[PDB]
């Protein structure tokens, strides 16, 4: 867990669960990439999936939580917790 | 009870899911000294040749031979 090294966002394009995460991606991605300059940030979409994030710290240890929240801010804090709870 | 197939056969052959060759085969085991059933392995595999089946419809619709007493009547046009 010496570092974050990769981030993967999964989300729908037009479903209901994913819109707050759509806003987070449209608005905060450059700030996320500057606050984590050494990490692959990956956004990958697919209709019908349940929005979710994956992180990879070191030696393949991957973490995960869903992002079925109702706000962009819940996304920020929830992402940040998963990034901290290495 | 079964009449054709082997006394311990497990399967029903003429089903379309049952492969031609079956699942088992028999040989003589010199060690055990017994005819023993083993999984199938063929020295020349089955070649179907049903993949050369015709791509054109071979025999079109036939010809009615219903007697007119059994044909559903056509109402007069008016």
């Amino acid at each position: 867990s010496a570092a974050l090294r990769e981030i993967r966002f999964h989300l729908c394009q037009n479903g209901s669960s994913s819109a707050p995460l759509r806003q987070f991606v449209k608005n905060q991605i450059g700030a996320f990439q500057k606050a984590n300059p050494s990490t692959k940030v990956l956004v990958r979409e697919a209709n019908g999936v349940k929005p979710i994030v994956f992180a990879r710290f070191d030696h393949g240890h991957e973490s995960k939580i869903g992002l079925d929240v109702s706000s962009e801010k819940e996304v920020a804090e929830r992402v940040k917790s998963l990034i901290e709870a290495k | 009870r079964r009449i054709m197939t082997d006394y311990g056969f497990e399967g029903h052959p003429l089903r379309k899911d049952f492969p031609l060759t079956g699942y088992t085969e028999v040989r003589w085991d010199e060690e055990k000294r017994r005819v023993v059933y083993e999984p199938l392995e063929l020295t020349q595999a089955f070649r179907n040749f049903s993949a050369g089946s015709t791509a054109w419809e071979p025999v079109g619709p036939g010809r009615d031979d219903r007697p007119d007493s059994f044909k559903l009547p056509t109402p007069k046009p008016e």
Partner: protein, 694 residues
């Protein structure tokens, strides 16, 4: 507008101006044909499509009669049956009795339609005998026996309309008509083999398949075409362990009935110069070895060498699955390494366009979108050598629509008018800001096609920045209905790689590696890989990367693994296994799991279903097979990836170079094919046969 009509009593609806035969197809009525192919222009020379229409006294040609409201059409009454028998009598007068030696036996339309719509016995016994004709020599790939021609003119129409090879024509007059090049020439086009699939009779036959097999013997399997990033669907035909041939399959959104010549004639490379056993290097020689011994040798090399962090390099080349690159990536990282890297020249560093959004490195406007195009721009790409099928689609659109094209690259001998206008970044900014910029703005469905050789340059950021500035600046290219920015990849692996990461991190980009696991890689240069490093090739063919290797581990080719391959559009397609991999060869991801276990790590999956659930955990569009998806993050994608981190690159003056110096002999399968050797000796511009003096 859709009309309505009657056909053998059934009623159907289709648009106006349509051919009657299309209506009949809609209504399921089977009608014969020789001269009519859906993707080609119409003609009426075979005269087998005749049907009776109450409006007209004679039978008329379904292939050409326009469809009209209220018309009634019979295809069963005695006149049609007689006319069909008569035509087939005439067709088979002067047809040689070559069926046993004709490679189309068992798959010839003439046999089937003579058995179904024709006479049991012929009345041509004449002593003067049948017409004869000589065989032409139009090159290695196409064998001719032109006594068998029925003069359908499918070949001519294809060549002159979809391919751009007008050397094929109709000489003579009357019964002495002869399809051919009037003098000895060669059918110079990368689409030449599709002619073979078009001829109904075996007057044009594949040569390296010439007599090897007959269709009833073959196991037809529906699979995917590596050798291009298009992902052209195909139909393989095996004879047990051997793969006899490849032929196309239908998919209107990708390949639409065509495939290139490389994909049809590289099969001959899957049965020669293969890897069947593991190998070890002990000096100048290789020594055959076991799997236990080589994997233990790899482990001892790891433990003796102690690579730390980003010293373990992973290289994935063209012709790789996505399961393999996933397993190689998870393993690499589990050893503490982020140096995953492509076999591209500048693969050591991360791409200029960024992998973050799929929209940045894909053919966004789908390949079915070129039909709707109005204006096009080609930057550093020769589509005739990268995805010929989409060059054919551009030409199909250029003929029947208003289309104006431009190019910024090496002057490319295209199958269409192109209006070349430079070879530098300077001319690129000039055109995009001068005239053709205005043409793209005032277009409704414009396209800006970038080659992947741009990604394989040191000054790629200077380009992708300018194109991104123009794209965001011009709405017509980027809207809520249309994304006219496109990256054309030339291999089937790069899109799947970028979809699962597989880009080097800048930290690893500067380390000099100690171990080098290179996967399907044969384009390496001997400079990317040091001397004192331990090297481990995985492949199915020994052409370049094996020669470097200290250890060589066989893999399987596309015909022997049910791999997933992602194409330029981002469409995921699943392959099928046609045969088992030969000898002591194994599926790749199994090899990487096992060596992983031999090393001080493991992967958490054991069988297929677990690898698939992993793929979904990496990216869920890798398990939406055949579905192409739109994307909502276009504006953001061009703002975050192309424009931002590329302002610091300065453009060079080095003029653009063609990415592919030879469409043949591009990858290992193809270099191992002697047919591509005969075809690269001929089909060269310097030969007289391949240039017409116009």
């Amino acid at each position: 507008a859709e009309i309505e009509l009657t056909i053998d009593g059934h009623k159907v609806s289709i648009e106006a101006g349509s051919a009657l035969i299309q209506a009949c197809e809609k209504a399921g009525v089977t009608v014969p044909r020789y001269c009519y192919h859906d993707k080609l222009a119409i003609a009426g020379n075979c005269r087998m499509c005749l049907v009776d229409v109450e409006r007209a006294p004679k039978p008329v040609a379904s292939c050409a009669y326009p469809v009209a409201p209220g018309m009634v059409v019979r295809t069963d009454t005695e006149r049609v049956k007689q006319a069909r028998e008569n035509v087939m009598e005439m067709m088979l007068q002067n047809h040689p009795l070559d069926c046993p030696v004709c490679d189309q036996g068992g798959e010839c339309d003439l046999q089937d339609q003579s058995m179904r719509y024709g006479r049991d016995r012929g009345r041509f016994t004449e002593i003067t005998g049948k017409r004869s004709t000589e065989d032409k020599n139009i090159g290695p790939l196409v064998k001719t026996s032109m006594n068998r021609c029925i003069h359908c003119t499918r070949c001519v129409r294809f060549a002159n309309d979809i391919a751009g090879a007008p050397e094929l024509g109709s000489s003579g007059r009357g019964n002495d008509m002869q399809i051919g090049t009037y003098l000895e020439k060669n059918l110079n086009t990368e689409l030449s083999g599709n002619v073979i699939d078009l001829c109904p009779v075996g007057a044009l036959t594949n040569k390296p398949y010439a007599f090897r097999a007959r269709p009833w013997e073959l196991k037809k399997t529906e699979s995917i075409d590596v050798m291009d990033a298009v992902g052209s669907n195909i139909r393989i035909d095996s004879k047990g362990v051997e793969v006899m041939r490849v032929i196309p399959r239908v998919h209107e959104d990708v390949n639409e009935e065509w495939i290139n010549d490389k994909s049809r004639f590289a099969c001959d490379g899957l049965k020669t110069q293969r890897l069947t056993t593991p190998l070890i290097r002990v000096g100048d020689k290789f020594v055959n070895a076991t799997w236990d011994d080589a994997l233990s040798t790899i482990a001892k090399a790891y433990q003796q060498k102690a690579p730390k962090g980003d010293e373990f390099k992973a290289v994935a080349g063209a012709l790789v699955e996505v399961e393999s690159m996933v397993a190689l990536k998870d393993m690499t990282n589990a050893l503490g390494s982020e140096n995953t890297t492509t076999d591209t020249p500048n693969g050591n560093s991360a791409p200029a366009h960024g992998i973050t959004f799929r929209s940045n490195y894909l053919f966004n406007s789908s390949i079915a979108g070129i039909e709707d195009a109005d204006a096009i721009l080609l930057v550093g790409t020769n589509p005739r050598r990268e995805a010929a099928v989409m060059n054919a689609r551009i030409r199909k659109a250029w003929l029947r629509q208003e289309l104006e094209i431009a190019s910024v690259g090496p002057t490319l001998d295209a199958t269409f008018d192109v209006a070349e206008l430079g070879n530098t970044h300077a001319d690129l900014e000039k055109a995009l800001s001068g005239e053709f910029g205005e043409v793209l703005k005032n277009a409704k469905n414009p396209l800006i096609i970038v080659g992947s050789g741009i990604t394989d340059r040191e000054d790629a950021g200077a380009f992708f920045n300018t194109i991104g500035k123009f794209v965001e600046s011009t709405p017509s290219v980027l809207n809520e209905n249309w994304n006219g920015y496109n990256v054309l990849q030339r291999s089937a692996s790069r899109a799947g790689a970028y979809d699962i990461g597989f880009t080097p991190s800048d930290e690893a980009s500067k380390t000099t590696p100690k171990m080098v696991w290179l996967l399907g890689a044969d384009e390496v240069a001997a400079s990317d890989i040091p001397a004192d490093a331990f090297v481990v090739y995985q492949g199915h063919n020994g052409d370049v990367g094996a020669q470097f290797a200290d250890v060589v581990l066989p893999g399987a080719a596309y015909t022997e693994k049910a791999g997933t391959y992602v194409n330029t559009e981002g469409r995921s397609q699943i392959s099928r296994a046609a045969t088992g991999p030969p000898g002591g060869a194994r599926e790749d991801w199994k090899i990487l799991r096992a060596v992983s276990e031999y090393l001080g790590v493991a992967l958490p999956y054991e069988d297929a279903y677990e690898v698939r659930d992993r793929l979904a955990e990496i990216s869920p569009s890798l398990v939406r097979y055949d579905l192409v998806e739109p994307t909502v993050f276009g504006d953001v994608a061009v703002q975050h990836s192309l424009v931002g981190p590329n302002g610091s690159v300065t453009p060079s003056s080095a003029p653009l170079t063609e990415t592919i110096e030879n469409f043949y002999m591009t990858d290992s399968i193809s270099r191992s094919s002697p047919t591509m050797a005969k075809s690269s000796i001929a089909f060269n511009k310097d030969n007289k046969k391949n240039q017409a003096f116009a």
